[PDB]
Design a protein around this nucleic acid. Structure first.
Ligand SMILES: [Mg+2]
Ligand SMILES: [Zn+2]
Ligand SMILES: [Zn+2]
Ligand SMILES: [Zn+2]
Ligand SMILES: [Zn+2]
Lengths: 107, 88, 209, 155
RNA sequence: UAAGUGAUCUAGAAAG
RNA sequence: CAGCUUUACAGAUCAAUGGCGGAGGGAGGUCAACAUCAAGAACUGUGGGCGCCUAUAGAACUUAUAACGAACAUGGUUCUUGCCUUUUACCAGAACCAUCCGGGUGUUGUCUCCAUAGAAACAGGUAAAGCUGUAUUUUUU
């Protein structure tokens, strides 16, 4: 149903965290996840005032917005990262220079 | 200069379908293109997500750019609204 | 910074305007396998198939050759042949190795002969020197079959072994053969003694292996 | 066409008459939109070309009925335009001079092309042929790589 | 004659 | 119901002077290219007076619980923290910095959809729109 679809979307956006590992690989998505959770808490309490506890709360908007904004940051990072990887695959580095500012190797 | 040709969606669909079972020396370059496209796949994702049809909408038509190789497809339009109306 | 493309007159075309695109580090040169700018031109607008440059400018300079034709810049002869001529009046040894070829390319010595071709002085002198220097039926009794075939045609499947020297021509028509006989190197049907002996020897040779 | 979602009213008056003509087109499109395992670049291109032609044809039919024949209401035409059926830009181009026989819009995007010019299809057969004659060679090009358009020109 | 209102960190994946 | 200024009007002599004049589009595209948008509350020229005063002027946009966003991401660098004990990946604050998702404004250029006139005022009318008016001591009885 349309309502069901909406609810599903909402679930996805809140549950990104559980639904699929992004956080594993980049653990600042954790902030985003937290924000989403907070929104859910707020939104659900607003939405289920006189109405009781259960699934079927739509109103995915703020969560969606949050995810969009998160994606903004990634765009850049991914373009450096993924792009770099593809470059490597086509043309794979010549003479890298290690860096002694590392704790290891300094001494 | 002169704007982009509004292509038919049919063409796009056909292109997409062709690059499913892609394993000939034909489209060697298309594979390369696809590989390259990872660069912009997150951008594409962001776009598509942004255009998500809202629950007051059965199905949104949306502007689309796509590499003629079939490697990547960006939803092009950026969805703006009359704020109060949107809120309502 | 980049040097210019060295494309010959016959290479490039017969027209007073050609448009080409440069593709910086387009392909690796065939000699050196080292990135370089591809120029590729279409000769006449509509005449099919492009003419991409196959070698790096440096390599061309070294060999003194068209970047498309792979022929001498001056005389338009294959590198071997041009070099061979010079030798006759020393040739280049392109080192066919992954690493070494690149090194060779980067060297700037004009490999071998190229110098002579480049200079009006030297090329001309060489030319002068060269000038001076210059100034059914079996078949029996080396030359190629494409010549034999031509000869046959003129006279009007054609098997010929060379170790044997025994050419069994089979026109498969009584008309062609009877025309062939009248219109006319021993040629029977399906110093003569010496010839016979030689033939026999050849046959023996063929048959021992 | 797009999918109906109660956005625009089902159709104006004379759609029932033309619908069966432009519903043949849909079938053709469907046949086109799929894995024809072309196994070959030229062959692959051909299907795309065919698709393009089909797209053009429907628009032409619509255009023809609305402008040249003038047998369809303005409102209906507008509705069609709004829907994905016709191509609006293409129609506009057709309406303009020198672009009446026009394979597709991207054959006259001068920006696109490597050499700053239009597609060859736009050259009238006459001129190319003449050039060929002058040269020595026969007729040089058959169809462009954007869309199959043997002699697109208005002549 | 007057107690007892509210402040609530976190949060996993790889390689080693 | 008077007066003057403008349109809509004949037929003028058409000087006189004005004003509309090298008199020729409009509406728009999830269309471009360029310029420019954090600075002494901050703008740009113009001459003149001689890098600064004095007149001219112009001025679109963004700003006072300070900003192009009633919107909010991510990087990089140091410093300090926290989980920790290897790093990435992280905690959270700071300072510089960048990237990004966007935004205007102006000028062109295009794309689309609708359209087509090269001359009218004066003497004053006809009709309609803008404003003013309603003799006995200081204005004109
Ligand atoms: Mg170790
Ligand atoms: Zn040449
Ligand atoms: Zn065409
Ligand atoms: Zn075309
Ligand atoms: Zn064409």
């Amino acid at each position: 149903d349309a309502f069901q679809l909406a609810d599903g979307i909402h679930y996805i956006l809140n549950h990104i965290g559980q639904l699929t590992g992004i956080y594993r690989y980049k653990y600042k998505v954790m902030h985003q996840i937290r924000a989403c959770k907070d929104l859910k808490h707020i939104i659900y309490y607003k939405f289920n005032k006189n109405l009781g506890k259960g699934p079927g709360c739509g109103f995915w908007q703020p969560a969606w917005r949050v995810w969009l904004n998160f994606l903004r940051g990634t765009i850049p990072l991914l373009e450096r990262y993924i792009g770099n990887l593809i470059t490597r695959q086509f043309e794979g580095r010549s003479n890298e220079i290690v860096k002694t500012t590392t704790k290891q190797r300094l001494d | 200069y002169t704007p982009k040709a509004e292509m038919p969606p049919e063409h796009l669909r056909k292109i997409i379908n062709t690059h499913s079972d892609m394993a000939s020396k034909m489209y060697n370059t298309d594979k390369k293109a696809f590989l390259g496209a990872l660069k912009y796949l997150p951008h594409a994702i962001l776009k598509l997500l942004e255009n998500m049809p809202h629950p007051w909408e059965q199905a949104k038509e949306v502007k689309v750019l796509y590499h003629t190789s079939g490697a990547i497809t960006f939803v092009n339009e950026t969805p703006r609204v009359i704020e109060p109306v949107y809120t309502a | 910074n980049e040097p210019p493309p060295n494309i010959c007159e016959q290479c490039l075309g017969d027209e007073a305007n050609i448009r080409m695109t440069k593709i910086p580090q387009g392909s690796e040169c065939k000699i050196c396998t080292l990135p370089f700018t591809l120029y590729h031109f279409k000769t006449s607008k509509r005449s099919n198939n492009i003419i991409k440059t196959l070698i790096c400018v440096r390599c061309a300079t070294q060999r003194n050759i068209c970047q498309c034709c792979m022929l001498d810049s001056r005389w338009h002869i294959p590198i071997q042949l041009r070099d061979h001529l010079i030798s006759l009046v020393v040739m280049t040894e392109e080192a066919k190795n992954d690493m070494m070829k690149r090194f060779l390319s980067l060297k700037n010595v004009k490999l071998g002969g190229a110098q002579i071709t480049s200079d009006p002085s030297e090329a001309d002198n060489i030319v002068d020197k060269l000038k001076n220097i210059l100034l059914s039926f079996f078949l029996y009794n080396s030359i190629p079959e494409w010549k034999i075939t031509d000869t046959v045609s003129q006279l009007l499947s054609l098997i010929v072994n060379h170790k044997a020297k025994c050419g069994g021509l089979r026109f498969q028509s009584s008309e062609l053969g009877e025309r062939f006989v009248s219109k006319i190197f021993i040629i029977p049907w399906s110093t003569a003694e010496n010839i016979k002996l030689s033939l026999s020897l050849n046959k023996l040779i063929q048959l021992e292996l | 066409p797009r999918i109906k979602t109660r956005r625009s009213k089902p159709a104006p008056d004379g759609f029932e008459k033309i619908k069966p003509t432009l519903t043949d087109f849909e079938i053709q499109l469907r046949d086109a939109q799929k894995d024809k395992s072309s196994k070959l670049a030229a062959k692959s291109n051909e299907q795309l070309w065919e698709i393009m032609q089909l797209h053009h044809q429907r628009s032409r039919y619509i255009y023809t009925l609305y402008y040249k024949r003038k047998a369809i209401s303005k409102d209906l035409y507008d509705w069609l335009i709004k829907e994905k059926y016709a191509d609006k830009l293409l129609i506009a181009k057709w309406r303009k001079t020198g672009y009446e026989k026009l394979c597709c819009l991207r054959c006259i995007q001068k920006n696109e092309t490597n050499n700053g010019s239009t597609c060859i299809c736009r050259v009238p057969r006459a001129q190319l042929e003449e050039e060929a004659r002058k040269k020595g060679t026969q007729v040089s090009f058959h169809q462009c790589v954007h869309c199959g358009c043997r002699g697109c020109a208005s002549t």
